[PDB]
């Protein structure tokens, strides 16, 4: 639109994302060019320090967001040789659990959490961006064809991301829906009715799924301490109803010594 001057493409998702200058405010913004109105009103009222601000909705459908240059994916890549320091891992994890708790207590699900979608600033903040309006962070209930999923899908994604900051490798780098499912099964064991009541009734569940044994989490995320492994295990419970909430995750002993370091 004529009050916005394009600076450069930020990325491509539903649509395309540009860095743009607002000619009216002089502000630099992220401009995303693309039932929906109620969804986008819920996003425009969601205001929290760990949620990217939806500044303006222009229907002529452009969504004007606050701009941040850096994301967690870019940061993980630049940090690959040394790793993200654990204080910063813990700070990023704690802040995303806060944004998620806010979202979830306002009946908003993210649905598509990934490192790419997590924007960081120079002061040590991290913010949920690009709400769901490639498969690595997908909860197994979504992969098993469940259409009426819960807030627990965002917890699973955040658990995957937590594991990835710790080990500097994606936890479950699936390249199709079945490879994704089977990567989850080879690590955590093939779910059954014992650990996940109702799993064998999921729309895309097949009795012919191979039966893998579970690996110990001490093998999965070394050198993470017992508090970090305890919390990760609770974020990665098969049964969405056993999966810890973002609010109860905030009171976990892992966050006892949480601080907010400056990234460098
Ligand atoms: O898609 C978003 O939500 C988004 C992406 C980049 C950015 F700087 C701000 C918002
Ligand atoms: O969902 C879990 O957390 C879980 C699944 C299988 C198992 F053997 C232990 C825990």
Swiss-Prot record:
Spans traversing the lipid bilayer: none
The protein's name in its UniProt record: Cyclin-dependent kinase 2
Homology family: Belongs to the protein kinase superfamily. CMGC Ser/Thr protein kinase family. CDC2/CDKX subfamily.
Effect seen on changing residue 9 to F: Reduced phosphorylation by CAK
Post-translational modification: Nitrosylated after treatment with nitric oxide (DETA-NO).
GO terms for MF: ATP binding; cyclin binding; cyclin-dependent protein kinase activity; cyclin-dependent protein serine/threonine kinase activity; magnesium ion binding; protein domain specific binding; protein serine kinase activity; protein serine/threonine kinase activity
Reactions that this protein is recorded to catalyse: L-seryl-[protein] + ATP = O-phospho-L-seryl-[protein] + ADP + H(+); L-threonyl-[protein] + ATP = O-phospho-L-threonyl-[protein] + ADP + H(+)
Modified residues (N6-acetyllysine): 6
Gene assigned in the entry: CDK2
Organism placement in taxonomy: Eukaryota, Metazoa, Chordata, Craniata, Vertebrata
Naturally occurring in which organism (per UniProt): Homo sapiens
Any Gene Ontology biological process: negative regulation of transcription by RNA polymerase II
Function: Serine/threonine-protein kinase involved in the control of the cell cycle; essential for meiosis, but dispensable for mitosis. Phosphorylates CABLES1, CTNNB1, CDK2AP2, ERCC6, NBN, USP37, p53/TP53, NPM1, CDK7, RB1, BRCA2, MYC, NPAT, EZH2. Triggers duplication of centrosomes and DNA.
InterPro entries linked to this entry: CDK, Kinase-like_dom_sf, Prot_kinase_dom, Protein_kinase_ATP_BS, Ser/Thr_kinase_AS
Family matches, as Pfam families: Pkinase (PF00069)
Residue numbers marked as site, CDK7 binding: 9, 73-74, 135
